[PDB]
Short mmCIF file of C-alpha atoms and ligand atoms in Angstrom, two decimals:
data_model
loop_
_atom_site.label_atom_id
_atom_site.label_comp_id
_atom_site.label_asym_id
_atom_site.label_seq_id
_atom_site.Cartn_x
_atom_site.Cartn_y
_atom_site.Cartn_z
CA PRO A 1 0.00 0.00 0.00
CA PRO A 2 -1.23 2.66 -0.34
CA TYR A 3 -3.71 1.05 -2.76
CA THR A 4 -5.31 2.97 -5.64
CA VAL A 5 -7.73 1.49 -8.15
CA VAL A 6 -8.23 3.44 -11.37
CA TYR A 7 -11.40 2.45 -13.15
CA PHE A 8 -14.63 3.49 -14.82
CA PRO A 9 -17.70 4.15 -12.62
CA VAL A 10 -18.99 0.56 -12.72
CA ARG A 11 -18.58 -2.57 -10.58
CA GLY A 12 -17.37 -4.68 -13.51
CA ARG A 13 -13.93 -6.24 -13.21
CA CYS A 14 -13.11 -4.34 -10.00
CA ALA A 15 -16.05 -5.69 -8.02
CA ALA A 16 -14.19 -8.78 -6.75
CA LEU A 17 -10.94 -7.07 -5.79
CA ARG A 18 -12.94 -4.36 -3.99
CA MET A 19 -14.85 -6.94 -1.97
CA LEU A 20 -11.50 -8.52 -1.15
CA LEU A 21 -9.97 -5.24 0.04
CA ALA A 22 -13.02 -4.38 2.15
CA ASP A 23 -13.41 -7.85 3.66
CA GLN A 24 -9.72 -7.87 4.59
CA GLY A 25 -10.04 -4.49 6.28
CA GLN A 26 -7.80 -2.67 3.81
CA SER A 27 -8.04 1.01 2.88
CA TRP A 28 -7.74 2.28 -0.68
CA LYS A 29 -8.40 5.18 -3.04
CA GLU A 30 -10.90 5.10 -5.90
CA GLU A 31 -9.65 6.97 -8.96
CA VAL A 32 -12.76 7.32 -11.11
CA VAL A 33 -12.24 7.68 -14.86
CA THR A 34 -15.23 8.94 -16.85
CA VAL A 35 -15.84 7.71 -20.39
CA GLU A 36 -15.49 11.37 -21.39
CA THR A 37 -12.00 11.55 -19.90
CA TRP A 38 -11.19 8.15 -21.38
CA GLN A 39 -12.13 9.34 -24.87
CA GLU A 40 -9.60 12.17 -24.49
CA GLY A 41 -7.10 9.38 -25.08
CA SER A 42 -4.03 10.24 -23.02
CA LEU A 43 -4.64 7.85 -20.11
CA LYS A 44 -5.56 4.96 -22.42
CA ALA A 45 -2.34 5.42 -24.39
CA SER A 46 -0.41 5.09 -21.13
CA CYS A 47 -2.08 1.86 -20.00
CA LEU A 48 0.07 -1.19 -20.78
CA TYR A 49 -2.75 -2.95 -22.61
CA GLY A 50 -4.79 0.17 -23.34
CA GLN A 51 -7.38 -0.77 -20.72
CA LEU A 52 -8.52 -0.43 -17.10
CA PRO A 53 -8.49 -1.35 -14.23
CA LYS A 54 -5.13 0.19 -13.41
CA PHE A 55 -3.86 -0.55 -9.92
CA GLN A 56 -1.26 1.26 -7.84
CA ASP A 57 0.31 -0.35 -4.79
CA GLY A 58 2.90 2.08 -3.51
CA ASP A 59 5.32 2.56 -6.40
CA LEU A 60 4.11 -0.59 -8.16
CA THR A 61 1.74 -0.15 -11.11
CA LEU A 62 -0.24 -3.17 -12.25
CA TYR A 63 -2.77 -3.86 -14.99
CA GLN A 64 -5.12 -6.84 -15.55
CA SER A 65 -7.92 -7.48 -13.06
CA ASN A 66 -6.76 -11.03 -12.28
CA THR A 67 -3.17 -9.87 -11.81
CA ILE A 68 -4.44 -7.49 -9.13
CA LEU A 69 -6.45 -10.28 -7.50
CA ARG A 70 -3.41 -12.58 -7.48
CA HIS A 71 -1.13 -9.80 -6.22
CA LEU A 72 -3.49 -9.05 -3.33
CA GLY A 73 -3.94 -12.76 -2.70
CA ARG A 74 -0.20 -13.34 -2.66
CA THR A 75 0.78 -10.42 -0.42
CA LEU A 76 -2.11 -10.80 2.02
CA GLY A 77 -1.80 -14.58 2.39
CA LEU A 78 -5.04 -15.46 0.60
CA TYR A 79 -3.57 -17.92 -1.87
CA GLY A 80 -3.91 -21.35 -0.30
CA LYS A 81 -2.03 -23.04 2.54
CA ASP A 82 0.43 -24.72 0.17
CA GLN A 83 1.45 -25.27 -3.44
CA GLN A 84 -1.35 -27.76 -4.07
CA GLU A 85 -4.15 -25.56 -2.73
CA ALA A 86 -2.63 -22.67 -4.66
CA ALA A 87 -3.00 -24.59 -7.94
CA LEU A 88 -6.60 -25.44 -7.08
CA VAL A 89 -7.15 -21.74 -6.30
CA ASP A 90 -5.90 -20.88 -9.80
CA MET A 91 -8.15 -23.55 -11.31
CA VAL A 92 -11.18 -21.98 -9.66
CA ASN A 93 -10.21 -18.45 -10.69
CA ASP A 94 -9.50 -19.49 -14.28
CA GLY A 95 -12.94 -21.08 -14.27
CA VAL A 96 -14.49 -17.88 -12.94
CA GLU A 97 -12.69 -15.87 -15.63
CA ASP A 98 -13.93 -18.12 -18.45
CA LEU A 99 -17.54 -17.61 -17.43
CA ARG A 100 -17.06 -13.89 -16.77
CA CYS A 101 -15.79 -13.55 -20.35
CA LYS A 102 -18.94 -15.17 -21.77
CA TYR A 103 -21.06 -12.99 -19.46
CA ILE A 104 -19.31 -9.84 -20.66
CA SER A 105 -19.80 -10.96 -24.27
CA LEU A 106 -23.53 -11.42 -23.68
CA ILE A 107 -23.91 -8.08 -21.90
CA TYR A 108 -21.99 -5.95 -24.39
CA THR A 109 -22.34 -7.64 -27.78
CA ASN A 110 -25.52 -9.71 -27.91
CA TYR A 111 -27.75 -9.23 -24.86
CA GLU A 112 -31.16 -9.20 -26.55
CA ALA A 113 -30.59 -12.03 -29.03
CA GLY A 114 -28.38 -14.13 -26.79
CA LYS A 115 -29.84 -14.03 -23.31
CA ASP A 116 -32.13 -17.04 -23.70
CA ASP A 117 -29.49 -19.47 -24.89
CA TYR A 118 -27.08 -18.10 -22.33
CA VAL A 119 -29.54 -18.71 -19.51
CA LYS A 120 -30.20 -22.24 -20.78
CA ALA A 121 -26.50 -23.03 -20.69
CA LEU A 122 -26.03 -21.42 -17.28
CA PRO A 123 -26.71 -24.48 -15.10
CA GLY A 124 -23.99 -26.47 -16.82
CA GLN A 125 -21.75 -23.44 -16.31
CA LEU A 126 -22.37 -23.28 -12.55
CA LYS A 127 -22.30 -27.00 -11.76
CA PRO A 128 -18.48 -27.10 -11.65
CA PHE A 129 -18.37 -24.71 -8.69
CA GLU A 130 -21.13 -26.59 -6.84
CA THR A 131 -19.04 -29.73 -7.43
CA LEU A 132 -15.87 -28.08 -6.11
CA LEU A 133 -17.84 -27.08 -3.01
CA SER A 134 -19.19 -30.62 -2.57
CA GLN A 135 -15.62 -31.91 -2.49
CA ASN A 136 -14.36 -29.57 0.24
CA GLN A 137 -15.71 -30.06 3.78
CA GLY A 138 -19.22 -30.55 2.45
CA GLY A 139 -19.13 -27.06 1.00
CA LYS A 140 -19.34 -25.48 4.44
CA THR A 141 -16.13 -23.46 4.23
CA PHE A 142 -14.62 -21.98 1.07
CA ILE A 143 -14.20 -22.95 -2.59
CA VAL A 144 -10.77 -24.48 -1.88
CA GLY A 145 -9.51 -25.39 1.59
CA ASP A 146 -10.61 -23.64 4.78
CA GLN A 147 -9.19 -20.17 4.19
CA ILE A 148 -10.78 -17.43 2.11
CA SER A 149 -8.42 -17.32 -0.89
CA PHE A 150 -8.80 -14.51 -3.45
CA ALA A 151 -10.69 -16.78 -5.87
CA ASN A 152 -13.68 -16.79 -3.51
CA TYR A 153 -14.20 -13.07 -3.98
CA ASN A 154 -14.11 -13.50 -7.75
CA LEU A 155 -16.47 -16.48 -7.59
CA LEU A 156 -18.79 -14.62 -5.19
CA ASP A 157 -19.05 -11.69 -7.58
CA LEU A 158 -19.70 -13.97 -10.55
CA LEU A 159 -22.53 -15.57 -8.62
CA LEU A 160 -24.07 -12.30 -7.46
CA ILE A 161 -24.21 -10.80 -10.95
CA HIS A 162 -25.72 -14.00 -12.34
CA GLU A 163 -28.50 -13.78 -9.77
CA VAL A 164 -29.28 -10.38 -11.28
CA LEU A 165 -29.08 -11.67 -14.86
CA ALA A 166 -31.20 -14.73 -14.16
CA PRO A 167 -33.05 -14.71 -10.81
CA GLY A 168 -33.18 -18.15 -9.22
CA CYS A 169 -30.17 -19.45 -11.15
CA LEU A 170 -28.75 -20.82 -7.89
CA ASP A 171 -31.93 -22.44 -6.59
CA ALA A 172 -30.90 -25.85 -7.95
CA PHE A 173 -27.49 -25.52 -6.28
CA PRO A 174 -27.69 -25.77 -2.45
CA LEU A 175 -23.97 -25.44 -1.73
CA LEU A 176 -23.59 -22.37 -3.96
CA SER A 177 -26.74 -20.81 -2.51
CA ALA A 178 -25.54 -21.27 1.08
CA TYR A 179 -22.02 -20.22 0.08
CA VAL A 180 -23.24 -16.87 -1.23
CA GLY A 181 -25.33 -16.34 1.88
CA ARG A 182 -22.49 -17.10 4.27
CA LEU A 183 -19.80 -15.05 2.54
CA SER A 184 -22.19 -12.14 2.03
CA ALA A 185 -22.80 -12.22 5.78
CA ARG A 186 -19.16 -11.69 6.74
CA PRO A 187 -19.36 -8.36 8.69
CA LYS A 188 -17.02 -6.14 6.65
CA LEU A 189 -18.20 -7.51 3.30
CA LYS A 190 -21.85 -7.16 4.31
CA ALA A 191 -21.25 -3.53 5.21
CA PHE A 192 -19.36 -2.92 1.96
CA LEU A 193 -21.99 -4.64 -0.15
CA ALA A 194 -24.63 -2.45 1.50
CA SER A 195 -22.70 0.80 1.00
CA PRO A 196 -23.42 3.50 -1.64
CA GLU A 197 -20.04 3.16 -3.35
CA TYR A 198 -21.13 -0.35 -4.24
CA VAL A 199 -24.92 -0.11 -4.45
CA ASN A 200 -25.04 3.11 -6.45
CA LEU A 201 -22.60 1.81 -9.05
CA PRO A 202 -24.02 -0.04 -12.07
CA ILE A 203 -22.85 -3.61 -12.61
CA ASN A 204 -21.88 -2.90 -16.21
CA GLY A 205 -21.20 0.15 -18.33
CA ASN A 206 -23.99 -0.15 -20.88
CA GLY A 207 -27.03 -0.14 -18.60
CA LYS A 208 -27.64 -3.87 -18.97
CA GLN A 209 -27.61 -6.63 -16.35
CA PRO B 1 5.55 -35.78 -11.17
CA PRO B 2 5.00 -38.05 -12.94
CA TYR B 3 3.45 -35.57 -15.39
CA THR B 4 0.66 -36.52 -17.81
CA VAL B 5 -1.08 -34.20 -20.26
CA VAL B 6 -4.47 -35.29 -21.58
CA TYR B 7 -5.32 -33.42 -24.76
CA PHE B 8 -6.51 -33.52 -28.37
CA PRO B 9 -3.87 -34.07 -31.08
CA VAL B 10 -3.08 -30.36 -31.50
CA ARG B 11 -0.55 -27.87 -30.16
CA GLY B 12 -3.28 -25.49 -29.06
CA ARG B 13 -3.39 -24.61 -25.38
CA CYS B 14 -0.73 -27.21 -24.45
CA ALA B 15 2.05 -25.88 -26.68
CA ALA B 16 3.46 -23.51 -24.05
CA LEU B 17 3.38 -25.94 -21.11
CA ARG B 18 5.01 -28.56 -23.33
CA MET B 19 7.81 -26.17 -24.29
CA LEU B 20 8.24 -25.39 -20.60
CA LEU B 21 8.52 -29.07 -19.66
CA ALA B 22 10.99 -29.70 -22.50
CA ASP B 23 13.11 -26.62 -21.89
CA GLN B 24 13.29 -27.49 -18.18
CA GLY B 25 14.38 -31.06 -18.90
CA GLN B 26 11.24 -32.66 -17.47
CA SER B 27 9.70 -35.96 -18.56
CA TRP B 28 5.99 -36.41 -19.18
CA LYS B 29 3.39 -38.62 -20.81
CA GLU B 30 1.04 -37.60 -23.59
CA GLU B 31 -2.41 -39.12 -23.51
CA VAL B 32 -4.08 -38.29 -26.81
CA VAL B 33 -7.85 -37.90 -26.97
CA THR B 34 -9.40 -38.19 -30.42
CA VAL B 35 -12.49 -36.17 -31.29
CA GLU B 36 -14.17 -39.54 -31.84
CA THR B 37 -13.37 -40.57 -28.26
CA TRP B 38 -14.43 -37.13 -27.03
CA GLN B 39 -17.85 -37.30 -28.67
CA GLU B 40 -18.42 -40.56 -26.78
CA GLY B 41 -18.98 -38.15 -23.91
CA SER B 42 -17.74 -39.97 -20.82
CA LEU B 43 -14.34 -38.28 -20.50
CA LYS B 44 -15.83 -34.83 -21.10
CA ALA B 45 -18.42 -35.42 -18.39
CA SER B 46 -15.63 -36.27 -15.94
CA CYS B 47 -13.75 -33.04 -16.72
CA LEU B 48 -14.38 -30.29 -14.14
CA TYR B 49 -15.25 -27.72 -16.82
CA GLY B 50 -16.04 -30.27 -19.51
CA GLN B 51 -12.82 -29.38 -21.32
CA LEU B 52 -9.18 -30.29 -21.95
CA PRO B 53 -6.28 -30.06 -21.26
CA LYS B 54 -6.41 -32.28 -18.21
CA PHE B 55 -3.14 -32.48 -16.29
CA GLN B 56 -2.02 -35.16 -13.87
CA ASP B 57 0.84 -34.45 -11.47
CA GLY B 58 1.23 -37.50 -9.27
CA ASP B 59 -2.09 -37.72 -7.44
CA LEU B 60 -3.08 -34.14 -8.25
CA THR B 61 -5.48 -33.61 -11.16
CA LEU B 62 -5.64 -30.13 -12.65
CA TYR B 63 -7.63 -28.46 -15.42
CA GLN B 64 -7.16 -25.06 -17.15
CA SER B 65 -4.09 -24.45 -19.29
CA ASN B 66 -2.97 -21.42 -17.28
CA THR B 67 -3.45 -23.22 -13.97
CA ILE B 68 -1.07 -25.88 -15.28
CA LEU B 69 1.46 -23.22 -16.35
CA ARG B 70 1.28 -21.47 -12.97
CA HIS B 71 1.51 -24.83 -11.23
CA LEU B 72 4.72 -25.72 -13.09
CA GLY B 73 6.02 -22.19 -12.66
CA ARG B 74 5.37 -22.33 -8.93
CA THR B 75 6.76 -25.81 -8.25
CA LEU B 76 9.77 -25.39 -10.56
CA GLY B 77 10.67 -21.91 -9.32
CA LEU B 78 9.89 -20.13 -12.59
CA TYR B 79 7.65 -17.42 -11.16
CA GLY B 80 9.85 -14.40 -10.50
CA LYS B 81 12.48 -13.75 -7.81
CA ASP B 82 10.05 -12.05 -5.42
CA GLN B 83 6.41 -11.12 -4.91
CA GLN B 84 6.79 -8.06 -7.13
CA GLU B 85 8.18 -9.87 -10.18
CA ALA B 86 5.55 -12.55 -9.64
CA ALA B 87 2.89 -9.88 -10.13
CA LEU B 88 4.56 -8.71 -13.34
CA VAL B 89 4.76 -12.32 -14.51
CA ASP B 90 0.99 -12.59 -13.99
CA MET B 91 0.43 -9.30 -15.80
CA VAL B 92 2.38 -10.65 -18.76
CA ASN B 93 0.52 -13.97 -18.78
CA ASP B 94 -2.90 -12.35 -18.50
CA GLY B 95 -1.99 -10.20 -21.49
CA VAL B 96 -0.94 -13.30 -23.41
CA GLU B 97 -4.19 -15.04 -22.50
CA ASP B 98 -6.28 -12.09 -23.72
CA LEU B 99 -4.66 -12.13 -27.16
CA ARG B 100 -4.75 -15.93 -27.37
CA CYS B 101 -8.52 -15.74 -26.81
CA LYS B 102 -8.85 -13.32 -29.73
CA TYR B 103 -6.60 -15.53 -31.84
CA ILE B 104 -8.73 -18.55 -30.98
CA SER B 105 -11.91 -16.66 -31.82
CA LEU B 106 -10.53 -15.73 -35.25
CA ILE B 107 -9.41 -19.29 -35.98
CA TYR B 108 -12.61 -21.10 -35.03
CA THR B 109 -15.42 -18.61 -35.65
CA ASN B 110 -14.44 -16.08 -38.32
CA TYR B 111 -11.19 -17.00 -40.03
CA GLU B 112 -11.85 -16.07 -43.68
CA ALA B 113 -13.80 -12.87 -43.07
CA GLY B 114 -11.91 -11.70 -39.99
CA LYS B 115 -8.26 -12.34 -40.80
CA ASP B 116 -7.44 -9.09 -42.56
CA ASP B 117 -8.82 -6.84 -39.82
CA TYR B 118 -7.23 -8.99 -37.14
CA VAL B 119 -3.83 -8.78 -38.81
CA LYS B 120 -4.31 -5.01 -39.15
CA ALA B 121 -5.00 -4.80 -35.41
CA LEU B 122 -2.14 -7.15 -34.52
CA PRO B 123 0.66 -4.55 -34.29
CA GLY B 124 -1.19 -2.73 -31.52
CA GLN B 125 -1.75 -6.07 -29.77
CA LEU B 126 1.98 -6.89 -29.88
CA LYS B 127 3.46 -3.52 -28.86
CA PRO B 128 2.78 -4.04 -25.13
CA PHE B 129 5.20 -6.97 -24.94
CA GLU B 130 7.83 -5.01 -26.89
CA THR B 131 7.35 -2.21 -24.39
CA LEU B 132 7.78 -4.63 -21.48
CA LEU B 133 10.96 -5.97 -23.09
CA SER B 134 12.40 -2.47 -23.51
CA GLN B 135 11.92 -1.85 -19.78
CA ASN B 136 13.82 -4.94 -18.63
CA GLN B 137 17.56 -4.75 -19.32
CA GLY B 138 16.96 -3.52 -22.86
CA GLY B 139 15.00 -6.66 -23.70
CA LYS B 140 18.20 -8.69 -23.76
CA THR B 141 17.02 -11.23 -21.20
CA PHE B 142 13.47 -12.38 -20.42
CA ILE B 143 10.05 -10.78 -20.31
CA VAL B 144 10.27 -10.13 -16.55
CA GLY B 145 13.54 -10.15 -14.61
CA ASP B 146 16.47 -12.32 -15.67
CA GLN B 147 14.91 -15.74 -15.05
CA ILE B 148 12.76 -17.61 -17.56
CA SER B 149 9.41 -17.50 -15.75
CA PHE B 150 6.55 -19.63 -17.09
CA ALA B 151 4.99 -16.58 -18.75
CA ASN B 152 7.91 -16.58 -21.22
CA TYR B 153 6.86 -19.93 -22.69
CA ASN B 154 3.28 -18.75 -23.16
CA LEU B 155 4.44 -15.51 -24.82
CA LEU B 156 6.86 -17.42 -27.07
CA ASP B 157 4.11 -19.72 -28.30
CA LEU B 158 1.77 -16.80 -28.91
CA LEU B 159 4.46 -15.05 -30.96
CA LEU B 160 5.29 -18.21 -32.91
CA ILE B 161 1.71 -18.96 -33.94
CA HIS B 162 1.13 -15.35 -34.92
CA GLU B 163 4.22 -15.53 -37.13
CA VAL B 164 2.51 -18.38 -38.96
CA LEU B 165 -0.74 -16.40 -39.15
CA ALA B 166 0.92 -13.19 -40.32
CA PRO B 167 4.51 -13.73 -41.53
CA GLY B 168 6.81 -10.84 -40.68
CA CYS B 169 4.54 -9.49 -37.93
CA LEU B 170 7.59 -9.27 -35.65
CA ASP B 171 9.70 -7.30 -38.15
CA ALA B 172 8.36 -4.07 -36.61
CA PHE B 173 9.47 -5.28 -33.19
CA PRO B 174 13.26 -5.73 -32.86
CA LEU B 175 13.10 -6.73 -29.20
CA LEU B 176 10.34 -9.31 -29.72
CA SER B 177 12.14 -10.68 -32.79
CA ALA B 178 15.49 -11.07 -31.04
CA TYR B 179 13.64 -12.49 -28.02
CA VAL B 180 12.03 -15.19 -30.17
CA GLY B 181 15.30 -16.05 -31.89
CA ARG B 182 17.05 -16.21 -28.53
CA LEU B 183 14.56 -18.46 -26.70
CA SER B 184 13.99 -20.68 -29.74
CA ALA B 185 17.74 -21.30 -29.77
CA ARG B 186 17.84 -22.69 -26.22
CA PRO B 187 19.19 -26.27 -26.82
CA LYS B 188 16.54 -28.46 -25.16
CA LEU B 189 13.76 -26.20 -26.46
CA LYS B 190 15.25 -26.04 -29.95
CA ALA B 191 15.35 -29.83 -30.11
CA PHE B 192 11.74 -30.05 -28.96
CA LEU B 193 10.49 -27.51 -31.49
CA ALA B 194 12.10 -29.48 -34.32
CA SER B 195 10.91 -32.91 -33.12
CA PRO B 196 8.08 -34.93 -34.75
CA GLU B 197 5.92 -34.72 -31.64
CA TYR B 198 5.75 -30.95 -32.06
CA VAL B 199 6.08 -30.50 -35.82
CA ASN B 200 3.60 -33.22 -36.83
CA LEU B 201 0.84 -31.75 -34.68
CA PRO B 202 -1.30 -29.01 -36.24
CA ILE B 203 -1.41 -25.68 -34.42
CA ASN B 204 -5.21 -25.82 -34.22
CA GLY B 205 -7.97 -28.39 -34.50
CA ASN B 206 -9.73 -27.12 -37.63
CA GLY B 207 -6.73 -27.05 -39.96
CA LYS B 208 -6.50 -23.26 -39.96
CA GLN B 209 -3.42 -21.25 -38.98
N1 GSH C 301 -8.05 -8.62 -19.34
C1 GSH C 301 -8.35 -7.27 -18.78
C2 GSH C 301 -9.57 -6.67 -19.50
C3 GSH C 301 -9.78 -5.18 -19.22
C4 GSH C 301 -10.98 -4.56 -19.94
O1 GSH C 301 -11.71 -5.24 -20.68
N2 GSH C 301 -11.17 -3.26 -19.70
C5 GSH C 301 -12.28 -2.49 -20.28
C6 GSH C 301 -13.30 -2.12 -19.17
S1 GSH C 301 -13.79 -3.55 -18.14
C7 GSH C 301 -11.75 -1.19 -20.90
O2 GSH C 301 -10.78 -0.60 -20.40
N3 GSH C 301 -12.42 -0.75 -21.98
C8 GSH C 301 -12.04 0.48 -22.68
C9 GSH C 301 -11.16 0.31 -23.89
O3 GSH C 301 -10.84 -0.85 -24.24
O4 GSH C 301 -10.78 1.34 -24.49
C10 GSH C 301 -8.61 -7.39 -17.27
O5 GSH C 301 -9.01 -8.48 -16.81
O6 GSH C 301 -8.40 -6.39 -16.54
N1 GSH C 302 -10.02 -21.99 -20.24
C1 GSH C 302 -9.64 -23.35 -20.70
C2 GSH C 302 -10.15 -23.57 -22.12
C3 GSH C 302 -10.15 -25.04 -22.56
C4 GSH C 302 -10.67 -25.30 -23.97
O1 GSH C 302 -11.08 -24.37 -24.71
N2 GSH C 302 -10.66 -26.58 -24.33
C5 GSH C 302 -11.12 -27.03 -25.64
C6 GSH C 302 -9.90 -27.46 -26.49
S1 GSH C 302 -8.62 -26.15 -26.63
C7 GSH C 302 -12.09 -28.21 -25.48
O2 GSH C 302 -11.96 -29.01 -24.54
N3 GSH C 302 -13.05 -28.30 -26.41
C8 GSH C 302 -14.04 -29.37 -26.41
C9 GSH C 302 -15.37 -29.07 -25.78
O3 GSH C 302 -15.59 -27.92 -25.35
O4 GSH C 302 -16.21 -30.00 -25.71
C10 GSH C 302 -8.10 -23.52 -20.65
O5 GSH C 302 -7.39 -22.50 -20.74
O6 GSH C 302 -7.63 -24.67 -20.51
#
């Protein structure tokens, strides 16, 4: 630290890392970039991959939402108890990222025409995470092992936004349903999730959800 | 170990991890899955995300190509010299993954119609890695620090397959070019890249490259 997240005024790909920071009792600065400012072009040209989020941790500048999640997970000890759990943590997060990418595609490129098929395919897309839960302490703790690795925050966000896209999409999945309830009840996260800086931010940048 | 990769008969998403294993002098088994066997359905159903590669390391079963790369990077000490380089390694690999996803989209969903635009956009997609090179000992070593982190193998594969797609695409990028020549020359890796088990596999599964 100090931590600074530079991003558009949406939850988007900063939602998970924000929940992580808040739940772990960290402080940070929100640098809000408006689409107007973004169109000016100077900031974009300075971003390694021409995109946000941009993350500052002291004198370290990072890009890539999952790089930030892994960085935070690594430095705060939320990356598994050993090399094996760590790999499983990656496997979960890579799974979360795959589905987030299809979600983002639906939202921004084909929402009207594609929503039905997407919702049909959703159960098969969620089953893996229910299954991971079923294989770890009866799904009563976290996605991997008994500590709250960074992948949980990313998974939690993926689940929450899919409840908005397709209400009831977790009804057929007891472990995922209870998982979201439990994690969302953690004191600091609950408070964060209920705050204006979260609630009054749209999930995506195009008005759809 | 022992290491086993379960995959279709293509370079695809296993090319980089294979190069890594070969360059690092590791031994592994290839279990080839034909599309015929895949359509039978049983293996797919047993895969966490219904996809390959599947990776066996002793009694640990992993899925997700990048999870496998990070697993080998972590257990073989090819993941930066400290927490800070590790973050940069991730930032590189996430960038590689983003472009690989676009490459894969082109190949399998829009090759004929999309190629020309994609190749036009390619220079902008490659510059970031040239920029990273120029900020690390003049690009005379590796993509991050002076050790060959796993991310290097993924970047090398990405560059190699794009050279097939758009010959000369690295001519505008002296650092990337020299980087490719340099890594490709590494003895064990050089031998691998020229061996039948690499050369006689197509880059992709639909015969396009
Ligand atoms: N792989 C990147 C993707 C970043 C990304 O898609 N950023 C979008 C907003 S979520 C952006 O900056 N769009 C504006 C632009 O591309 O000019 C990550 O995970 O951070
Ligand atoms: N995110 C996964 C993607 C895996 C993937 O796309 N696998 C393809 C082959 S490259 C597959 O199994 N296709 C068959 C199917 O989906 O049934 C990774 O990086 O490993």
